[PDB]
Design a protein around this ligand. Structure first.
Ligand SMILES: [Br-]
Ligand SMILES: [Br-]
Ligand SMILES: [Br-]
Ligand SMILES: [Br-]
Ligand SMILES: [Br-]
Ligand SMILES: [Br-]
Ligand SMILES: [Br-]
Ligand SMILES: [Br-]
Ligand SMILES: [Br-]
Ligand SMILES: [Br-]
Ligand SMILES: [Br-]
Ligand SMILES: [Br-]
Ligand SMILES: [Br-]
Ligand SMILES: [Br-]
Ligand SMILES: [Br-]
Ligand SMILES: [Br-]
Ligand SMILES: [Br-]
Ligand SMILES: [Br-]
Ligand SMILES: [Br-]
Ligand SMILES: [Br-]
Ligand SMILES: [Br-]
Ligand SMILES: [Br-]
Ligand SMILES: [Br-]
Ligand SMILES: [Br-]
Ligand SMILES: [Br-]
Ligand SMILES: [Br-]
Ligand SMILES: [Br-]
Ligand SMILES: [Br-]
Ligand SMILES: [Br-]
Ligand SMILES: [Br-]
Ligand SMILES: [Br-]
Ligand SMILES: [Br-]
Ligand SMILES: [Br-]
Lengths: 110, 110
């Protein structure tokens, strides 16, 4: 089970939950999240880890260019954590309203 | 900015987002999440870190032992992470419906 992944690894899965992405695209999505540079030497060993764990699939479209996507197991890991997080966050009606507004605004911005 | 916290520290904040809790209660909420024992020596040094970071506040009680709660900044950190997670997860209408259903079912259980 994926509840023991690092925050960095979990953030990779969150990025790929949006859509499959090239490795370099994952890097810049994480940099936008952290507000700090993400080194290749940290990203790609962690991607390899997630592939070995069966949570991410790697596709070598060309040389130097790899595309990564969640497996169903990786998607389950994303949903599992989101469900646990929401189980704790939705503690009353005000919390429910906040989350519902976040979701509706995100869907409207698609 | 608390986006650099470890997953363990972020999970502490998630637990306290549900409600203020005694230290021992935090530990069992984390153990139910992880499905493994959480040692005293992992929990309390990290509670200390979160207090020093201004994300958690501590109160010594006369009924049990010690109660921890999110500060305003700690709540902001939980909301911020949830907002980012949802910004990636709510990627089409089906994802929107899934989260709406998670929230609705969590609210029904209150
Ligand atoms: Br795993
Ligand atoms: Br971590
Ligand atoms: Br990390
Ligand atoms: Br995390
Ligand atoms: Br891409
Ligand atoms: Br790219
Ligand atoms: Br590397
Ligand atoms: Br391939
Ligand atoms: Br090509
Ligand atoms: Br790439
Ligand atoms: Br699969
Ligand atoms: Br699962
Ligand atoms: Br989550
Ligand atoms: Br859950
Ligand atoms: Br309320
Ligand atoms: Br409610
Ligand atoms: Br609220
Ligand atoms: Br409402
Ligand atoms: Br709101
Ligand atoms: Br911080
Ligand atoms: Br951790
Ligand atoms: Br409690
Ligand atoms: Br306690
Ligand atoms: Br304890
Ligand atoms: Br207790
Ligand atoms: Br659980
Ligand atoms: Br304090
Ligand atoms: Br989250
Ligand atoms: Br966001
Ligand atoms: Br939609
Ligand atoms: Br879905
Ligand atoms: Br019901
Ligand atoms: Br009902």
């Amino acid at each position: 089970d994926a509840r023991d992944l690092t925050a960095f690894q979990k953030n990779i899965l969150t990025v790929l939950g949006e859509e499959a992405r090239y490795g370099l695209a994952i890097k810049r999505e994480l940099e936008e999240y952290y507000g700090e540079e993400v080194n290749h030497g940290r990203l790609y060993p962690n991607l390899d880890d997630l592939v070995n764990k069966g949570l991410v699939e790697k596709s070598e479209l060309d040389k130097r260019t790899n595309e990564y996507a969640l497996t169903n197991e990786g998607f389950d890991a994303v949903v599992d954590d989101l469900e646990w997080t929401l189980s704790k966050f939705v503690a009353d009606a005000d919390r429910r309203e906040r989350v519902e507004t976040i979701v509706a605004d995100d869907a409207a911005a698609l």
